Amino acid sequence: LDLKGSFLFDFEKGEFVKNADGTLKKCDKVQAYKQWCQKAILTPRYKKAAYTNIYGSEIKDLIASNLSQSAKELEITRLIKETILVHPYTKEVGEFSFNWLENSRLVEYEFDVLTIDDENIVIDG
Amino acid sequence: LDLKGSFLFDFEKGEFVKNADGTLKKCDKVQAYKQWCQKAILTPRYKKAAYTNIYGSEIKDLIASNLSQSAKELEITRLIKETILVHPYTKEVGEFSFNWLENSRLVEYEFDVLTIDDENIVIDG
Amino acid sequence: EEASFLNGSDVVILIDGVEELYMEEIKADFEQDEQSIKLLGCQNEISRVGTTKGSFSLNGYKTDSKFAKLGFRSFEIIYNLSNSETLGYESIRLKNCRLKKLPLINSKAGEIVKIEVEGSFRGYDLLNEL
Amino acid sequence: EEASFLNGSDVVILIDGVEELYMEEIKADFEQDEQSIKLLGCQNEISRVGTTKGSFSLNGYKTDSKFAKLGFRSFEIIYNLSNSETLGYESIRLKNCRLKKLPLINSKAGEIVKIEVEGSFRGYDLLNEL
Amino acid sequence: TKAWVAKNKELGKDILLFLGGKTEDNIKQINDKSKSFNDENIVNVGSSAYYENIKYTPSEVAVYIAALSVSKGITGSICNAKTIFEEVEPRLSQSEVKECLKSGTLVLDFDDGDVIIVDDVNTFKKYVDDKNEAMGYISNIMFINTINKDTSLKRKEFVGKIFNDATGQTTVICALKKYFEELMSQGIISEFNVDIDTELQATAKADEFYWKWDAVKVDVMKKIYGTGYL
Amino acid sequence: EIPGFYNRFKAQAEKAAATGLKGRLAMPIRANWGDVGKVVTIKNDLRQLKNLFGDDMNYSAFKLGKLALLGNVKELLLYRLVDGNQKKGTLTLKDTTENSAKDVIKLETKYPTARNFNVTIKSNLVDSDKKDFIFFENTKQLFSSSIKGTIDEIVLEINSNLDNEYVIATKVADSDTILANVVNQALEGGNDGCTSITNESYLKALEEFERYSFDSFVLDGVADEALQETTKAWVAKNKELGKDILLFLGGKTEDNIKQINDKSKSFNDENIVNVGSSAYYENIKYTPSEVAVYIAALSVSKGITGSICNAKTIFEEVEPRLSQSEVKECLKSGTLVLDFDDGDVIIVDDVNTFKKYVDDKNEAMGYISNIMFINTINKDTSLKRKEFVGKIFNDATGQTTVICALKKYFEELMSQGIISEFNVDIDTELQATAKADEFYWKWDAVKVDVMKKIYGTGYL
Amino acid sequence: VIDIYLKNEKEKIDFHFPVNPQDSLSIKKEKRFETVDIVNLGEFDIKKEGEKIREISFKTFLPNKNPIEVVAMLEKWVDQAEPLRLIITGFGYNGLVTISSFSNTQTAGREEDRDIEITFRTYRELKITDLKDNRPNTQTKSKIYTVKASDTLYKIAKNLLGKGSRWPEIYNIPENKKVIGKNPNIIKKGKLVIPSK
């Protein structure tokens, strides 16, 4: 598999976190994976020409769509799941929850499950 | 495919449109295709010996027929569709509508769809 | 509130264009085989119309061999109900009606010889609307 | 204990928004195809709800060709029951109702020409709760 | 035009006004203009646009904005409608976008080759002191104005032309309730109620009747918040 | 926010896992930070505890609160026990242009404490007319912001930004010029009040806790015999008032098994529990009194259905390790003992200090689950009582309504599978003399117990 | 609240079923396995690694677009090679499918209506460390493109034909060679360009 790490990017500030030495703050495999997941979720699909069709999501395009509330919930689940699952490190993403707090303003939750979260059988002959 | 253009023929005047130079007004591929479609619709089938059985329609013969109103609608749809679709440039013809305005005097609409009107999938490996 | 009802005494029946005044009971219904199907999303069940089937019952007192001679031949029944308190009348005709069974024989003790006829009709026309 | 009942004299019926005051009997039920299934562990059988099917019966005295002219067209029935001993009223409307059979003809002897109508309705709305 | 529309509102004609600032006005001038008049019936366009290689001033763009808002009617909204325009000027950062939208300015924004209107707002943004919050958006105002117009249309058939008894009032209430039920069938509204205005009915007379109503409009989905538990 | 798509990411630990928990616990915690002299409720959120009382493991607050939260308590009622001598960290900052260096702003910590909160102000490099106002906790930065030079705006900004849960500003005087540049000026003069807590101070926490309601109470990891006796008397008094509080205690660190058993036998109330073994967690030793916090948390979280007869505890190692004879001696003595079994520290037999008598049906009172069950039923019955005392007419219909309510509550208990059989009827003996302000009734139920032991016999 | 949306892509149509799927929806799942029986031990079950093509079938009616046009649309879609996107809200299904069988029926009454009985098949695409290619590629664009101001032919190739280096396929078409100048690098706004295939 041999996945590798990356450098932190504080999305709150929109800038790379750098040590006092001036070098960018290196991060572990899982940290880089989480950063990539957030970036891919924030990246629209088919629109940023630097990427292939695999990368990105289509959540923003869904806002203008005319599908119903539950249809939009299913579309959000499908879009987030498809966007995340391209990464090899991903095992499963699910347990989606939704809360239409105001009349038409939504909050949704999801769980991402890693390949390392798998459970291994213990046996040998 | 390599379809080619033709010369305009103003069916309102029944004469070829010619430039000030005296040459006939050349037209694009799609314009010649539309001219051919109108001419084929206006050409009766099996009766003009210069053409094969493929070219022409049988709309005029249907007027004297004894079939009912809806049967005549279906016959008109079939005849126009068959007459138009022989051209390679045609993709689909349909969305037929009818309006028996007076007691027995009819107005009908149709849509012709070109090969260029098709929609193409965007993907490459 | 006013009295504008109607009574069976005003009933006039033309069996094949002939007044069968001896009939003292008639009823005809135009029923439909309404399909009722239940949809996935809707709590309440959806009812869809179907074809119509006309049925009629006609019984009275025998005075001749009219119906036995008639057999199962198609005929027409024109029912006229006329308002007498105020002018106006209803007039119905059963377009094509046929018998379901001939009352061939019927009698009992000293009772009057009653006759009962039941059949079906394809359609109807409404000629007067009161 | 006090007298606060209601009588059919207080009934007011609007057939398609028109007062058919001549109707002297009406009843409508909203029934459900309750599935009853028996479970392995439970002695008592489990009843599960199903879809709802509205049915209504309406019979009265004929005064015109209203129902025969109406045919099987969809219409609405607004039933209002008003308490007279004390103020307050119940008001129901059958949201979408259709006939099951036209009482085309009905009459007998000198009896008043009675009319009986039976049909189904998809749903209802409760507008007043007393 | 502001005074004229206000006068027509006093006459029962609810006219929605669309405006656009001058070509040379900067964002500061646009926001000052939007704050100066903050009527819900007024809209300010804060960005110029281009179409067919021709520049369009904010006032010219207001024509297309008004056309889209009117065409959307009740069900639709222009919260993120993809406009016909091809390019915009000025291009605003998120801070400038927030400043303009808080100021009641309607701003077109460029997003991946598409010019998109943002948030459907109008000039009414100064107060928003609870349920007046909803008045800041064009769709809600159009919804209210359309209901008022339909109610006035039903009024003019009955003012001084139907007997002002209990039966006539009940008939009018039934007509209004059925109109709101037709609105329900469109999916516009989640809940509604219309009843007698008992307070005003204590003194009403033949030429006019009084009633009350309130409804819960279904809004178009505008934003999504996601939280990925990892 | 603007319309559009927004998203964030959080660790699975930060899920709202507080849903589905049970039970309420109380603690008179020693805390370096937070409100003083009052009870506060936490919904089992470690971040909430960190914000309210810091994260200093040396102080009992964070330590025992973390152990309690690990016990899955629905709500923790924490009280900041204090010695007095209370002070908040404070500092005064002064003006530059005045040659006398006028004091213009006073800063103060939000709560009393002794932590090294500091302030550093430097000239804003972009613009000298502004300055950077960075606030520190020891060497660690804690909040930064640049403000206009006028005093009121500086105080408002320091009181405005989100990360100022630690410090609050206040104006001493007005001036035209920015504060003087300074680096890491400690907010001296504060005091957490945790130094040399008095024995009497626990009584204030007890009295404040009396007004509140909770299922159990546990001491602040202190094994002082006087405090244990005072809490015993206090819990007995609250039982006389109808508040059935379950007490958990732990013997002193130096006490051997003999001393623990003697203490358990000396007071054998069913509402008291003695922890007889120390434990280790995160490489940190925990005295029996400290372990009693986690034991009480687990007992409270299990509620009615569950029990801690063989619950696998979070602890990693125990001391002393007891043989089967010593285990039998301790359990017979009413001592609750954790035992090490194949890498897992497991509580044994759910017992309490009540083991001297067990002369009947009083046998069942020796286990914590039964006492919790009885106390919960008593609390629910009292809650239903207080809605009707002197507020419903004392006729046959009202008594029947009350009986129906009690019977339906016990039927809800039946639906949980807690009870195998129950009966509630009229207390005819006491009803012969009852009056309007009170009604009397009787009941008894058969609780379903958790399976504890298995006996097998292999016929071969 | 249950709805059924068929979002076709090769024909930019989003069909919403006017009427719910009558009695019931149903979906089966069956694991891929086949028995193997060993001597003196008996039968054993061996999992097969792949997944199965499962169907969703129901029946509706189209009340009085007209039902005739809807039936024609669905019959045309039945021959479509590209997949349809089926979304069922209350049931919870969402994924690419394709219609195996479709049928319409007129009854003695209700002649305007058309009783429908349609079935679907789960669709899966054959693609014949780095990120997995799990995403379906169902996006469609018009076969004729109007060049914008900022576009370059490489950008057009990447946006409309994939790899980006596919631009000579666009250029080599004689119509494109005629509308475009002889220099592929220089291109103008407004002129129409025809992607291949």
Numbering used by the authors:
A (entry chain m), B (entry chain p): 24 to 148
C (entry chain d), D (entry chain Z): 8 to 137
E (entry chain g): 243 to 472
F (entry chain e): 13 to 472
G (entry chain T): 2 to 65, 78 to 141, 154 to 222
Task: Show the paper's wording.
It is formed of two proteins, gp62 and gp63, providing a pointed end terminating the tail. Furthermore, exhaustive bioinformatics analysis of all proteins encoded within the φCD508 structural cassette (including those not modeled but identified by MS-MS analysis of purified virions) identified no enzymatic domains or motifs with predicted peptidoglycan hydrolase activity. It is also striking that the needle spike protein lacks the β-helix observed in other CIS structures, and instead, the OB-fold is connected directly to the metal-binding apex domain. However, the notable feature of φCD508 is that the needle lacks the otherwise widely conserved β-helix. It is currently unknown as to whether there is an advantage or requirement for this compact needle, but homology searches for other needle spikes lacking β-helix domains find widespread examples in phages infecting distantly related S-layer–producing bacteria. It is striking that we find no obvious auxiliary domains with structural homology to peptidoglycan hydrolases in any of the φCD508 baseplate or needle proteins built to near completion within our cryoEM maps. Missing from the final structure are the tail fiber (gp67) and predicted receptor binding protein (gp68); only a short section of the tape measure protein (gp59) was modeled. Clear helical density with sidechain density is visible for the TMP lazo domain (dark blue). Interaction between the tape measure protein and the N-terminal bundle domain of the needle tip.
The virion can be divided into five distinct regions: the head, neck, tail, baseplate, and needle. Structures of purified φCD508 virions in both extended and contracted conformations were determined by single-particle EM of frozen-hydrated samples; the resolution ranged from 2.6 to 4.0 Å for the extended phage, and 2.9 to 4.2 Å for the contracted form.
